[PDB]
Scaffold this motif. Structure first.
Motif, PDB file in Angstrom:
ATOM      1  N   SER A 282       0.874  -1.201   0.000  1.00 17.66           N
ATOM      2  CA  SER A 282       0.000   0.000   0.000  1.00 17.66           C
ATOM      3  C   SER A 282       0.908   1.247   0.000  1.00 17.66           C
ATOM      4  N   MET A 283       0.299   2.434   0.050  1.00 15.99           N
ATOM      5  CA  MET A 283       1.013   3.702  -0.046  1.00 15.99           C
ATOM      6  C   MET A 283       2.147   3.819   0.955  1.00 15.99           C
ATOM      7  N   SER A 284       3.361   4.055   0.410  1.00 19.90           N
ATOM      8  CA  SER A 284       4.628   4.180   1.188  1.00 19.90           C
ATOM      9  C   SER A 284       5.030   2.848   1.932  1.00 19.90           C
ATOM     10  N   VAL A 285       4.504   1.715   1.473  1.00 24.67           N
ATOM     11  CA  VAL A 285       4.735   0.394   2.116  1.00 24.67           C
ATOM     12  C   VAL A 285       4.957  -0.611   1.010  1.00 24.67           C
ATOM     13  N   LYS A 286       6.227  -0.901   0.730  1.00 24.38           N
ATOM     14  CA  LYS A 286       6.610  -1.831  -0.339  1.00 24.38           C
ATOM     15  C   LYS A 286       7.353  -3.053   0.099  1.00 24.38           C
ATOM     16  N   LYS A 287       6.984  -4.221  -0.460  1.00 27.23           N
ATOM     17  CA  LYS A 287       7.874  -5.387  -0.423  1.00 27.23           C
ATOM     18  C   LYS A 287       9.254  -5.023  -0.952  1.00 27.23           C
ATOM     19  N   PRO A 288      10.294  -5.717  -0.465  1.00 24.37           N
ATOM     20  CA  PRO A 288      11.644  -5.514  -1.008  1.00 24.37           C
ATOM     21  C   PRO A 288      11.750  -5.744  -2.553  1.00 24.37           C
ATOM     22  N   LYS A 289      12.579  -4.882  -3.176  1.00 25.32           N
ATOM     23  CA  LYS A 289      12.661  -4.766  -4.654  1.00 25.32           C
ATOM     24  C   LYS A 289      13.438  -5.944  -5.343  1.00 25.32           C
ATOM     25  N   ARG A 290      12.703  -6.959  -5.825  1.00 22.74           N
ATOM     26  CA  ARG A 290      13.240  -7.955  -6.813  1.00 22.74           C
ATOM     27  C   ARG A 290      13.999  -7.346  -8.039  1.00 22.74           C
ATOM     28  N   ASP A 291      15.194  -7.876  -8.292  1.00 20.24           N
ATOM     29  CA  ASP A 291      16.061  -7.362  -9.394  1.00 20.24           C
ATOM     30  C   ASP A 291      15.487  -7.943 -10.691  1.00 20.24           C
ATOM     31  N   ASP A 292      14.947  -7.059 -11.521  1.00 24.08           N
ATOM     32  CA  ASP A 292      14.312  -7.452 -12.791  1.00 24.08           C
ATOM     33  C   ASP A 292      15.140  -6.980 -13.998  1.00 24.08           C
ATOM     34  N   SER A 293      16.347  -6.481 -13.748  1.00 27.99           N
ATOM     35  CA  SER A 293      17.185  -5.826 -14.793  1.00 27.99           C
ATOM     36  C   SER A 293      17.749  -6.770 -15.884  1.00 27.99           C
ATOM     37  N   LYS A 294      17.826  -8.065 -15.556  1.00 20.52           N
ATOM     38  CA  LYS A 294      18.219  -9.144 -16.443  1.00 20.52           C
ATOM     39  C   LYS A 294      17.059  -9.928 -17.105  1.00 20.52           C
ATOM     40  N   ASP A 295      15.835  -9.492 -16.911  1.00 14.20           N
ATOM     41  CA  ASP A 295      14.675 -10.265 -17.381  1.00 14.20           C
ATOM     42  C   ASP A 295      14.618 -10.308 -18.923  1.00 14.20           C
ATOM     43  N   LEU A 296      14.820  -9.138 -19.553  1.00 10.91           N
ATOM     44  CA  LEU A 296      14.854  -8.981 -20.998  1.00 10.91           C
ATOM     45  C   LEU A 296      15.812  -9.980 -21.665  1.00 10.91           C
ATOM     46  N   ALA A 297      17.036 -10.005 -21.189  1.00 11.83           N
ATOM     47  CA  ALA A 297      18.027 -10.881 -21.680  1.00 11.83           C
ATOM     48  C   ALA A 297      17.744 -12.334 -21.431  1.00 11.83           C
ATOM     49  N   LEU A 298      17.323 -12.669 -20.231  1.00 16.96           N
ATOM     50  CA  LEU A 298      17.015 -14.067 -19.905  1.00 16.96           C
ATOM     51  C   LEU A 298      15.804 -14.613 -20.719  1.00 16.96           C
ATOM     52  N   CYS A 299      14.740 -13.812 -20.852  1.00 17.36           N
ATOM     53  CA  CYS A 299      13.592 -14.211 -21.746  1.00 17.36           C
ATOM     54  C   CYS A 299      14.052 -14.472 -23.216  1.00 17.36           C
ATOM     55  N   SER A 300      14.970 -13.606 -23.708  1.00 12.57           N
ATOM     56  CA  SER A 300      15.588 -13.737 -25.030  1.00 12.57           C
ATOM     57  C   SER A 300      16.358 -15.054 -25.194  1.00 12.57           C
ATOM     58  N   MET A 301      17.087 -15.458 -24.167  1.00 14.21           N
ATOM     59  CA  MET A 301      17.812 -16.707 -24.194  1.00 14.21           C
ATOM     60  C   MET A 301      16.889 -17.908 -24.202  1.00 14.21           C
ATOM     61  N   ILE A 302      15.854 -17.865 -23.388  1.00 11.64           N
ATOM     62  CA  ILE A 302      14.846 -18.902 -23.367  1.00 11.64           C
ATOM     63  C   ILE A 302      14.200 -19.096 -24.748  1.00 11.64           C
ATOM     64  N   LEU A 303      13.827 -17.973 -25.384  1.00 14.10           N
ATOM     65  CA  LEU A 303      13.141 -17.916 -26.637  1.00 14.10           C
ATOM     66  C   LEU A 303      14.061 -18.487 -27.709  1.00 14.10           C
ATOM     67  N   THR A 304      15.363 -18.115 -27.656  1.00 16.21           N
ATOM     68  CA  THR A 304      16.407 -18.689 -28.560  1.00 16.21           C
ATOM     69  C   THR A 304      16.453 -20.211 -28.456  1.00 16.21           C
ATOM     70  N   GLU A 305      16.444 -20.712 -27.240  1.00  9.03           N
ATOM     71  CA  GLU A 305      16.463 -22.159 -27.016  1.00  9.03           C
ATOM     72  C   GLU A 305      15.180 -22.804 -27.552  1.00  9.03           C
ATOM     73  N   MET A 306      14.065 -22.095 -27.449  1.00 11.86           N
ATOM     74  CA  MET A 306      12.821 -22.624 -27.986  1.00 11.86           C
ATOM     75  C   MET A 306      12.787 -22.614 -29.524  1.00 11.86           C
ATOM     76  N   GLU A 307      13.335 -21.546 -30.100  1.00  9.12           N
ATOM     77  CA  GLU A 307      13.527 -21.412 -31.550  1.00  9.12           C
ATOM     78  C   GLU A 307      14.367 -22.486 -32.216  1.00  9.12           C
ATOM     79  N   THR A 308      15.364 -23.001 -31.512  1.00 13.17           N
ATOM     80  CA  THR A 308      16.321 -23.942 -32.047  1.00 13.17           C
ATOM     81  C   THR A 308      15.994 -25.402 -31.641  1.00 13.17           C
ATOM     82  N   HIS A 309      14.971 -25.645 -30.816  1.00 12.52           N
ATOM     83  CA  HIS A 309      14.513 -27.030 -30.535  1.00 12.52           C
ATOM     84  C   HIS A 309      13.964 -27.689 -31.833  1.00 12.52           C
ATOM     85  N   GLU A 310      14.226 -28.989 -32.008  1.00 16.85           N
ATOM     86  CA  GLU A 310      13.803 -29.664 -33.231  1.00 16.85           C
ATOM     87  C   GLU A 310      12.304 -29.778 -33.451  1.00 16.85           C
TER      88      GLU A 310
END
Length: 115
Positions: free
Chosen positions: A1-29
């Motif tokens: 709620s207002m001025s009351v937050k759960k601790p901040k999960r690091d999401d800065s690598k999400d873009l890259a990690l989703c891209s790697m997953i998608l690459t692996e899915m693209e290259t599966h037979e």
């Protein structure tokens, strides 16, 4: 709620990690039914039945152009690819099996990478 937050999960690598997953899915037979949009002129029934077509190349373009707000929205489009496959294809078909296999593959990379 207002001025009351759960601790901040690091999401800065999400873009890259989703891209790697998608690459692996693209290259599966077993990716071949999923690489490109289903041709809606040439596959009777697809347009009317499948309300929200999705495929890996379309997910790749959304990713590269900042159209996923967060990693959950990305997981939803990937799942949509397999849910559509299940809706249109018999379990006992090459494409039906491909779908089940790819979904299993995806869900494991997802859990190992993020949970």
């Amino acid at each position: 709620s207002m001025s009351v937050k759960k601790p901040k999960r690091d999401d800065s690598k999400d873009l890259a990690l989703c891209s790697m997953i998608l690459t692996e899915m693209e290259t599966h037979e077993d990716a071949w039914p999923f690489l490109l949009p289903v041709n809606l002129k040439l596959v009777p029934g697809y347009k009317k039945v499948i309300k929200k077509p999705m495929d890996f190349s379309t997910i790749r373009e959304k990713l590269s152009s900042g159209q996923y707000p967060n990693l959950e929205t990305f997981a939803l489009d990937v799942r949509l690819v397999f849910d559509n496959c299940e809706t249109f294809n018999e379990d006992d078909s090459d494409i039906g099996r491909a779908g089940h296999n790819m979904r299993k593959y995806f869900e494991k990379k997802w859990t190992d990478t993020f949970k």
